[PDB]
Write a protein that binds this ligand. Structure first.
Ligand SMILES: CC(C)(Oc1ccc(C(=O)c2ccc(Cl)cc2)cc1)C(=O)O
Ligand SMILES: CC(C)(Oc1ccc(C(=O)c2ccc(Cl)cc2)cc1)C(=O)O
Length: 270
């Protein structure tokens, strides 16, 4: 692990810390309850949802969502969070060496297919087996409450929890996750790329730094890099299924609206 490779890892780590409001260190501090006796407000049923939404009234009233079905309200708010994360991933990508120099349409394409893989990767940091932190760690929506919603909404998040439990068992830290997210974005085989050669060059550099970083930071998890290559493949499959579910909601749910700022990402994705 050469000094230049360590420096690239720390600079990507820095960009990740400066661009994402929530990181795994903060998440685990809250989920563990060590730094405080004031835990997040728990949304575990329809009544505690409605209580939480008293705080979120202005968010709901903004788009006239407040009289919608609870399932629609919940995932309106979740969409708003995705849009926020997409904005942060877009700034973060500037710190990947070479990304900003790519053809603008290639940057758009890399983000189009990459953001949700990174989103579900990073979501793992705010999940445990019982639920997920929401609202910058201030609330906690239980896994069972999400499974209790009417179909198809009860099937949206459960496969993300299933992915996260195995991902979290890898015990990645934020230095690892920042390079993983960088590697997710630099995939050379997204549909519609223009300069595949330039991108593969950029990808090989990030994947090389990632492998050596993992070997240095988790010396006792010898095949951690191969394990994370498989997670990258699992995430691409997870996102493909998510897109198909989004498509089914679009076709079968009349009163649910796809956030303007996510319509373009999903348009013709898979
Ligand atoms: C500033 C504030 C409160 O920031 C939020 C950040 C994240 C979320 C969520 O992701 C969320 C999703 C579903 C529920 Cl049920 C509750 C919360 C909501 C609000 C807002 O924008 O009003
Ligand atoms: C992770 C998340 C929030 O997952 C979704 C979950 C539910 C919906 C919807 O409720 C919906 C509403 C209208 C349409 Cl047309 C399609 C879907 C959208 C995305 C995302 O992808 O950011």
């Amino acid at each position: 692990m050469t000094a230049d490779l360590k420096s690239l890892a720390k600079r990507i780590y820095e960009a990740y810390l400066k661009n994402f409001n929530m990181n795994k260190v903060k998440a685990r501090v809250i989920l563990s309850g060590k730094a405080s006796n004031n835990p997040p407000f728990v949304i575990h049923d329809m009544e505690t949802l409605c209580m939480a939404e008293k705080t979120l009234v202005a968010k709901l009233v903004a788009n006239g969502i407040q009289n919608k079905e609870a399932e629609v309200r919940i995932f309106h708010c979740c969409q708003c969070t995705s849009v926020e994360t997409v904005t942060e991933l877009t700034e973060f990508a500037k710190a990947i060496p070479g990304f900003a120099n790519l053809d603008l349409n290639d940057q758009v394409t890399l983000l189009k297919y990459g953001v949700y893989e990174a989103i579900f990767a990073m979501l793992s940091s705010v999940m445990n087996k019982d639920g997920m932190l929401v609202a910058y760690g201030n609330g906690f929506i239980t896994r069972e409450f999400l499974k209790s919603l009417r179909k198809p909404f009860c099937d949206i998040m459960e496969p993300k929890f299933d992915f996260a439990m195995k991902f979290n068992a890898l015990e990645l830290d934020d230095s690892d996750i920042s390079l993983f997210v960088a590697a997710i974005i630099c995939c050379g085989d997204r549909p519609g790329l223009l300069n595949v050669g330039h991108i593969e060059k950029m990808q090989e550099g990030i994947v090389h730094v990632l492998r050596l970083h993992l070997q240095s930071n988790h010396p006792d998890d010898i095949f951690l890099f191969p394990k994370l290559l498989q997670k990258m493949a699992d995430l691409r499959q997870l996102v493909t299924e998510h897109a198909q579910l989004v498509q089914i909601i679009k076709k079968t749910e009349s009163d649910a609206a796809l956030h303007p700022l996510l319509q373009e990402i999903y348009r013709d994705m898979y």
